[PDB]
């Protein structure tokens, strides 16, 4: 839904739409060249179909051309400083593609707001949405937006014939929460099957590998996913059906 | 507690056998929800 989608927000504020119950493939994607740049960090594309999924989150917003590179880990820059901070780990995909047939108003697309001033260069995934004058410098700036102080957020005014360096892109970013819990958004498989006492490679959503599987004489906590060996290997799992 | 924009809550229920004390026993504490909410927390109060 959110890709062939209607209306997208700013960058300092956005719409984390947690998604559940899905069977996502993402191979409906990374084959539609309508994605401009698609660079992934925790996972490589065409591989994010296998087992790596527990309540991922989405991120929709809009920005002009050059700004896409700023969104990677690190990559310091105004949008990444006061407007949208990306952590240094587990970052998943980054979808960038053109937002020009829905944007770039004739006189300018005046409705895309970036925080021009803010102390404390953004914390990871921080949403500072409130718009108070910066109070910059030793000065009263108290509803006055006066000297040394003015509106924290500004527009871009993209034009329908605007420049490619500033042609505006609609950017999607997917976070990925790994393995902690019952999974939710798997990749097509099921094998409808389960067998014991036989060397078989396994993919019980929480790991891959090969072994011999027995109904175990040990009790777990209900919420609790699965054990682990002192060897930091999978002691046992809970079959999500059985 | 809050780390990396989340929020976590934990629970336990042992009986009460004191009036003006706090039990010098121990029991573990178990996860409740890994609340993923983008807020800063510095002040907090209870509800009676």
């Amino acid at each position: 839904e959110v890709f062939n989608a209607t209306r997208f927000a700013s960058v300092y504020a956005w719409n984390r739409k947690r998604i559940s119950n899905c069977v996502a493939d993402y191979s409906v994607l990374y084959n539609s060249a309508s994605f401009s740049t698609f660079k992934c960090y925790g996972v490589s594309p065409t591989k994010l179909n296998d087992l790596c999924f527990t309540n991922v989150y989405a991120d929709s917003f809009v920005i002009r051309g050059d700004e896409v590179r700023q969104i990677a880990p690190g990559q310091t820059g105004k949008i990444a400083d006061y407007n949208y901070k990306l952590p240094d780990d587990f970052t998943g995909c980054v979808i960038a593609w053109n937002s020009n047939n829905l944007d770039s108003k004739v006189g300018g697309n005046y409705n895309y707001l970036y925080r021009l001033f803010r102390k404390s260069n953004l914390k990871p995934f921080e949403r500072d949405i409130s718009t108070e004058i910066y109070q910059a410098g030793s000065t009263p700036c108290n509803g006055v937006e006066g000297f040394n102080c003015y509106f924290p957020l500004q527009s871009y005014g993209f034009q329908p014939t605007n420049g490619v360096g500033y042609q505006p892109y609609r950017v999607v970013v997917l976070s990925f929460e790994l393995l902690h819990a019952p999974a939710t958004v798997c990749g097509p498989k099921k094998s409808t099957n389960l067998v014991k006492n036989k060397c078989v490679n396994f993919n019980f959503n929480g790991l891959t590998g090969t072994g011999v599987l027995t109904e175990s004489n040990k009790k777990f906590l209900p919420f609790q996913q699965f054990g682990r060996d002192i060897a930091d290997t999978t002691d046992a799992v809970r079959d999500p059906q059985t | 507690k809050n780390i990396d924009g989340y929020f976590k809550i934990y629970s336990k229920h042992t009986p009460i056998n004191l009036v003006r004390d706090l039990p010098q026993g121990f029991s573990a504490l178990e996860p409740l929800v890994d609340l993923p909410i983008g807020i800063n927390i510095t002040r907090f109060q209870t509800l009676l």
Binding site: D235 | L22, A28
Partner: peptide, 23 residues
């Protein structure tokens, strides 16, 4: 009113089971 919190407060670090192993 100040009392001494003796040893309460230990909480599960995460949702990964382990068995009879110190950690």
């Amino acid at each position: 009113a100040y009392t001494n919190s003796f040893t309460r407060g230990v909480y599960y670090p995460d949702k990964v089971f382990r068995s009879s192993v110190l950690h």
